[PDB]
Design a protein around this ligand. Structure first.
Ligand code: HEM
Ligand SMILES: [K+]
Length: 249
């Protein structure tokens, strides 16, 4: 149920221009995982019942960056500011979601559809809406389902975003990559999850919760066996995530 706003031709030209420059910049800086995290932490604050939070540019606000869940994302915001300044017509809201789509693409993942038109909103949401890594399946459904309004399939697919990147003990406190190829967007997150803990590789309690939940576990198996199926479900979930509260909820 999305009705995307009309934006001017000049706006659409800037989107296409910005998309290309974001590819070059993110590939050069090797920061795709961090940019995906910035996009996801921007959007993941949406609460469907109140229609507050969501991907509306507030994460660049120092009050939102200071949330402990966002440790390390001020680096991301800073990295992007010079490029953003070359595209003054774009909202920060659109710019950060576009960076997220590009981060998935340049690491070899699916092409997530992107629609412009998000407005930058004045007030960041309250802290505490993003998921706690030490909790489990009920928690995940509270946050992805009851707050953001996403499905159980969306939760497992989006968890696969950890196929790129790593944790840092000075940011979350957790440390290391989930995969042997953490700048490559593939289904490796799920195959590692299934195989046991391997030395050097990370699994959060929130990752392991997927293995024991009766709805989540069949999806983990699907994705581990069929990367195309993962890509399809990932692309659907990321688009929905990136559009929470936008063009209708
Ligand atoms: C399912 C609930 C989730 C939890 C509990 C969670 C938790 C975490 C934690 C604790 C970190 C480590 C931060 C650090 O120390 O640097 C992290 C990193 C990361 N997260 Fe998630 N996350 C979740 C979902 C997501 C989703 C939905 C996405 C995007 C689709 C995502 C993408 C990433 C990425 C790409 C990193 C790596 C960042 C980097 O390499 O610097 N995560 N997550
Ligand atoms: K990977």
């Amino acid at each position: 149920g999305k009705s995307y706003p009309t934006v001017s031709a000049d706006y659409q030209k800037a989107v296409e221009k910005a998309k290309k420059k974001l590819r070059g910049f993110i590939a050069e800086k090797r920061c795709a995982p961090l940019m995906l995290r910035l996009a996801w932490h921007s959007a993941g604050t949406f609460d469907k019942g109140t229609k507050t939070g969501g991907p509306f540019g507030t994460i660049k606000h120092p009050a939102e960056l200071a949330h402990s869940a966002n440790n390390g994302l001020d680096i991301a915001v800073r990295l992007l500011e010079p490029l953003k300044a070359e595209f003054p017509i774009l909202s920060y809201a659109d710019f950060y979601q576009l960076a997220g789509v590009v981060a998935v693409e340049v690491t070899g993942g699916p092409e997530v559809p992107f629609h412009p038109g998000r407005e930058d909103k004045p007030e960041p949401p309250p802290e505490g809406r993003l998921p706690d890594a030490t909790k489990g399946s009920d928690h995940l459904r509270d946050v992805f389902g009851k707050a953001m309004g996403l499905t159980d399939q969306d939760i497992v697919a989006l968890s696969g975003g950890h196929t790129i990147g790593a944790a840092h003990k000075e940011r979350s406190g957790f440390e290391g990559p989930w995969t042997s190829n953490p700048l490559i967007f593939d289904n490796s997150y799920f195959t590692e999850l299934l195989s046991g803990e391997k030395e050097g590789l990370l699994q959060l309690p929130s990752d392991k919760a997927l293995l024991s939940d009766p709805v989540f576990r069949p999806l983990v198996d699907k994705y581990a066996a069929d990367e195309d199926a993962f890509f399809a479900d990932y692309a659907e979930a990321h688009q929905k995530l990136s559009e929470l509260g936008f063009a209708d909820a």
